């Protein structure tokens, strides 16, 4: 049949009413009402600058959308790719199975890239843009996007595509008539950590993830590509690592596959940031190299915090030749990244202390078998690993490490320095380590586990009950979690945040639901740092969820669709 209802805006809420035949008032479709009833309409994330949507919509012909690139340059193929993708994205306003009438105005999109040669990812990159929409002559629409760089330009394309609504009452494709928007992200680093080691993720699912990221302007895919459970990274120089380390020969990331993902990311403003986690979290792949200790050590509880146990042996020099080669193979294929993540998850002192080679080596350096000495061994490892990373990437570049006993702000400056090392924070936001680190000059990526661990909440994967960081974290908690509140006056030292999906209990099948649409909550927090809380973003969050589903993403359902159709009636 055809849609029976209509919606009217009353005190910021779209309320459902019978579409009565005896009325001289034009009925509004659901999302047409939402576009002007909501403070920010259907936009996600909301702009940080001018956000003026005017009062009207204009009927648009889907086949009359043309894109013109005004300043040609070295980003030509990227801009042409993003332009070609524009039509497909506008089509996302239209629900599947619904066909818009081909009538209405023509749409001219004018892309102005002020520095058309700039293709590099950096923390200082300019992601700002400006968007104006306006009637041009009679039969057409002028959409002008102006940005300092390609990245701002394609963010602008994303926002513009969000200014289309499908009227399912009339079968009309509509677009906001008069728009003035200026926008720039609050934080340079907006990411998702994907663990592809604890379980395998098809590369299509990784690309699909990147798509969903670009839709909400997340700019960083942190690819945690190895751990103790597997080595899917294809290293041409050390091929036995992946041959013995992969879950199967099918479950692997080839050079061609990684290049595809990296390029796919670049086109969508997503930096693909590789991690090689060391000296802990190593395991499969290293068999018979004699370069590890404690692999599969039983009882595991006595050695590491989760099975299988395994750690690199810093005392073997051949190790750094392995490391150099791995980093080199990574540097070749992940060639858009300006940053390298070197892990540094808690090293087990028990693990290192159960080896003869290691104790002998520490005897000779006069170091003892106490704590500070194993901290010295770790530092020795990190200094050498770091040198090899610098060589592999052909330059010094920023390195990321997790908070750990090594990164304790009290002694951190013995080991690292704040110019070369960025610290990813997985503690709580109320943890004293954060203020210590900030006071000592260090930069942070907030992945605090009480608000940002997307794996929390499910059944236990060892024993019974629930998993370690339960309860499950709803989008509300991830929205209200503010790095500005956490870092206070030192907030410029916060580079941004990252949603972490650890994969002990997640893979190809579960990934859409794990990330979406909670990552969108993080996306807006990082993009706009709103002083407003989640309830103010609720309605738009429900819409963005629907947009994800339309994109083919299997996003988690937040609320009954009834709530979405009847704003204000679901509350607590
Ligand atoms: C086994 C047992 O009976 N333990 C009880 C507990 O009541 C309690 O100790 C708990 O033991 C668990 C297993 O040793 C600990 O779980 C582990 O926690 C770490 C984080 O500290 C997890 O690793 C991190 O998190 C992600 C996954 O979210 C993981 O993928 C990353 O590699 C890692 N890093 C982010 C740090 C890089 C780890 O996966 C998890 N392991 C599990 C669940 O097997 C748990 O932390 C610990 N709980 C507490 C509250 O300390 C202990 C309390 O006295 O008593 C033990 O008898
Ligand atoms: C072909 C055309 O109409 N171009 C105009 C341009 O001059 C103007 O700066 C922009 C923003 O107002 O809108 C458009
Ligand atoms: C940090 C730690 O556990 N150190 C111990 C050390 O005290 C002990 O004397 C030695 C003997 O094997 O083994 C190890």
Select from 348, 350, 356, 369 the residue to mutate for testing ligand 3; criterion: most ligand atoms less than 8 Å from CB.
Answer: 369
Backbone angles phi, psi at 328, to 5 degrees: -60, -50
Q: What is the spatial order of strands in the sheet that 129-136 belongs to?
A: 51-52, 179-183, 129-136, 140-147, 105-113, 57-69, 172-176, 164-167
**Protein residues with CB under 6 Å of any ligand 3 atom:** 349, 353, 369-370
Residue 51: how many other CB atoms lie within 10 Å:
18
265-296: b (≥16 Cβ within 10 Å) or e: bbbbbbbbbbbbbbbbbbbbbbeebebbbbbe
Token match 């080991």: residue?
A: 415
- Residue 489 among the catalytic residues: no
Beta strands in 279-418 (DSSP E): 292-293, 311-312, 340-343, 399-402
Q: Which residue has the tokens 């024993």?
A: 463
DSSP code at position 164 = E
Considering the candidates 227, 455, 546, 567, report the single residue annotated as catalytic. 227
DSSP annotation of 293 reads E
Residue 179 CA neighbour count, 13 Å, CB half: 30
Q: Strand pairing partners for 67?
A: 109
Ligand 2 site residues, Cβ closer than 6 angstroms: 132, 134, 136, 142, 144
What are the structural domains of the chain? 1-184 (3.30.379.10), 185-572 (3.20.20.80)
Q: Which long-range contacts (CB under 8 A, 24 or more apart) does 132-138 make?
A: 132/179, 132/180, 132/181, 133/160, 133/163, 133/175, 133/176, 133/177, 133/178, 133/179, 134/177, 134/178, 134/179, 135/58, 135/105, 135/177, 135/178, 136/108
Residue with tokens 């992601």: 127
Helix (H, G, I), strand (E, B) or coil at 212: helix
Q: Which two tokens stand for residue 120?
A: 């590099």
CA 334 to each of CA 255, 262, 311, 329, 346: distance values in angstroms, whole numbers, following the listed order: 9, 6, 25, 9, 26
- With H, G, I as helix, E, B as strand and everything else as coil, classify residue 207: helix
Distance from the alpha carbon of residue 266 to the mean position of ligand 2, in angstroms: 29
Resolution limit in angstroms? 2.5
The bound ligand whose nearest atom lies closest to the alpha carbon of 349 is: 3
Tokens of 483: 């790095």
Q: Is 310 left (phi over 0), alpha (psi -120 to 50) or beta?
A: left
Tokens 């294929």 locate to: 333
CA distance readout (Å), 69 to 44, 114, 162, 244: 25, 11, 20, 49
Asked if 495 and 172 touch (Cβ cutoff 8 Å), the reply is no
What's the CA-to-centroid distance between 549 and ligand 2, angstroms?
35
Method of determination is: X-ray
Enclosing H/E stretch for 222: strand 220-224
Q: Among all chains, which residue has been given the structure tokens 């990164």?
A: 407
Reduced to 3 states, what is the DSSP secondary structure of residue 565?
helix
Nearest CA to ligand 2 atom 7: 144
- 318-333 helix and 371-392 helix, angle to the nearest 10 degrees: 40
Give, in order, the Cα–Cα distances in Å from 263 to each of 70, 81, 101, 333: 24, 11, 36, 10
Residue reference for tokens 């008069």: 178
Ligand 3 centre and the CA of 353: distance in Å?
7
Residue of the nearest CA to atom 10 in ligand 2?
A: 144
Q: With left for phi above 0 and alpha for psi between -120 and 50, is residue 294 left, alpha or beta?
A: left
Q: Report the Cα–Cα distance between both ends of the chain, in Å, rounded.
A: 35
> Of 435, 451, 385, 440, which Cα lies nearest the Cα of 412?
440
CA dihedral 324, 328, 329, 331 (to 10 degrees): 140
- Answer for the pair 158, 494: CB distance below 8 angstroms, yes or no: no
State how far the Cα of 9 lies from the Cα of 28, in Å rounded to an integer: 9
552, 209 contact by CB (below 8 A): no
C-alpha closest to that of 245 among 229, 224, 225, 257: 229
Residue 172 structure tokens = 């009309």
227 as an active site residue: the answer is: yes
> Quick one: three-class SS letters along 471-517?
CCCCHHHHHHCCHHHHHHHHHHHEEEEEEEECCCCCCCCCHHHHHCC
State yes or no: is 490 an active-site residue. no
- Show the tokens assigned to 477: 């908690």
Residues in the chain: 572
- Does residue 472 contact residue 456 with C-beta atoms inside 8 Å? yes
- 49: three-class secondary structure by DSSP: coil
Catalytic pick among 281, 455, 543, 546: 281
For ligand 1, mutation pick of 281, 282, 305 (most atoms within 8 Å of CB): 305
């Amino acid at each position: 049949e055809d849609v029976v209802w209509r919606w009217s805006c009353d005190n910021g809420k779209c309320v459902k009413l019978k579409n009565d035949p005896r009325s001289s008032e034009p009925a509004l479709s659901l999302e047409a009402c939402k576009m002007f009833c909501n403070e920010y309409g259907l936009l996600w994330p909301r702009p940080t600058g001018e956000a003026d949507l005017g009062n009207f919509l204009s009927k648009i012909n889907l086949n009359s959308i043309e894109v013109k690139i005004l300043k040609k340059g070295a980003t030509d193929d990227l801009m042409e790719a993003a332009a070609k993708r524009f039509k497909e994205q506008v089509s996302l306003a239209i629900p599947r199975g619904s066909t818009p009438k081909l009538t209405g105005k023509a749409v001219d999109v004018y892309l102005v890239n002020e520095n058309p040669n700039e293709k590099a990812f950096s923390l200082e990159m300019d992601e700002s843009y400006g968007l104006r929409v306006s009637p041009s002559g009679a039969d057409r629409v002028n959409a002008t996007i102006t940005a300092n760089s390609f990245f701002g330009m394609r963010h602008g394309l994303e926002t513009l595509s969000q200014l289309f609504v499908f009227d399912d009452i009339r079968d009309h494709l509509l677009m906001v008539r008069d728009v003035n928007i200026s926008d720039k992200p609050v934080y340079p680093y907006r990411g998702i950590l994907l663990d592809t080691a604890r379980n395998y993720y098809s590369i299509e699912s990784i690309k699909r993830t990147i798509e969903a990221m670009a839709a909400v302007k997340l700019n960083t895919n942190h690819w945690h590509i190895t751990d103790s459970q597997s080595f899917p990274f294809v290293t041409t120089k050390r091929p036995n690592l992946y041959k013995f380390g992969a879950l199967s020969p099918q479950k692997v990331y080839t050079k061609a596959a990684i290049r595809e993902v990296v390029r796919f990311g670049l086109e969508r403003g997503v930096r693909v940031l590789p991690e090689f986690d060391a000296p802990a979290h190593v395991g499969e792949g290293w068999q018979d190299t004699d370069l590890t200790v404690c692999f599969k050590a039983e009882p595991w509880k006595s050695y590491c915090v989760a099975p299988p146990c395994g750690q690199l042996n810093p005392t073997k020099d051949e190790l750094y030749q392995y490391l150099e080669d791995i980093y080199s193979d990574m540097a070749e294929v992940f060639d858009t990244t300006d940053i390298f993540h070197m892990g540094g998850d808690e090293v087990s002192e028990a693990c290192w202390n159960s080896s003869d080679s290691i104790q002998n080596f520490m005897m000779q350096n006069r170091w003892d078998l106490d704590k500070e000495s194993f901290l010295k061994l770790w530092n020795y490892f990190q200094q050498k690993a770091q040198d090899k990373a610098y060589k592999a990437f052909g330059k010094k570049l920023p390195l990321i490490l997790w908070t750990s006993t090594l990164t304790n702000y009290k002694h951190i400056d013995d080991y690292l320095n704040k110019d070369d090392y960025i610290i990813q924070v997985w503690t709580t936001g109320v943890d004293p380590q954060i203020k210590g680190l900030l006071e000592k000059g260090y930069r942070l990526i907030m992945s605090n586990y009480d608000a940002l661990y997307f794996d929390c909440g499910y059944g236990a994967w060892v024993g019974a009950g629930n998993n370690w960081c339960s309860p499950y974290i709803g989008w509300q908690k991830v929205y209200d979690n503010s790095p500005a509140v956490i870092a206070l006056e030192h907030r410029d030292q916060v580079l941004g945040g990252e949603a972490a999906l650890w994969s002990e209990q997640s893979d190809t099948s579960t990934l859409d639901g794990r990330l979406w649409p909670r990552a969108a909550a993080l996306a807006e927090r990082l993009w706009a740092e709103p002083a407003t809380s989640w309830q103010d973003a609720e309605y738009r969050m429900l819409h963005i969820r629907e947009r994800f589903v339309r994109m083919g993403i299997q996003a988690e359902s937040l609320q009954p669709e009834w709530c979405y159709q009847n704003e204000g009636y679901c509350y607590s």
